[PDB]
Amino acid sequence: LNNHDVHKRYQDRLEEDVEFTINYELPLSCLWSTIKDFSSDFEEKTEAFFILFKELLRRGHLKLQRDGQIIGHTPEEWEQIFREVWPEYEIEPNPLPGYAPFDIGMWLTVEAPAYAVW
Residue 113 contacts its own copies per CB under 8 A: no
Please state, in angstroms and rounded to a whole number, the distance separating the CA atoms of residues 20 and 72: 25
- Cβ 2 to its own copies, closest distance in Å? 26
Select the residue interacting with its own copies from 26, 71, 91, 117 (CB under 8 A): 26
C-alpha span between 104 and 91 (Å, rounded): 6
Is 109:27 a contact under the CB 8 Å cutoff?
A: yes
Q: Does 33 bind its own copies (CB under 8 A)?
A: yes
Nearest residue (CB) to its own copies, 80 versus 100: 100
Q: What is the DSSP letter of 115?
A: E
Q: Are 35 and 48 in contact (CB under 8 A)?
A: yes
Binding-site ranges for its own copies (CB under 8 A): 16, 20, 23-27, 29-30, 33-34, 36-37, 101, 105-106, 109-110, 118
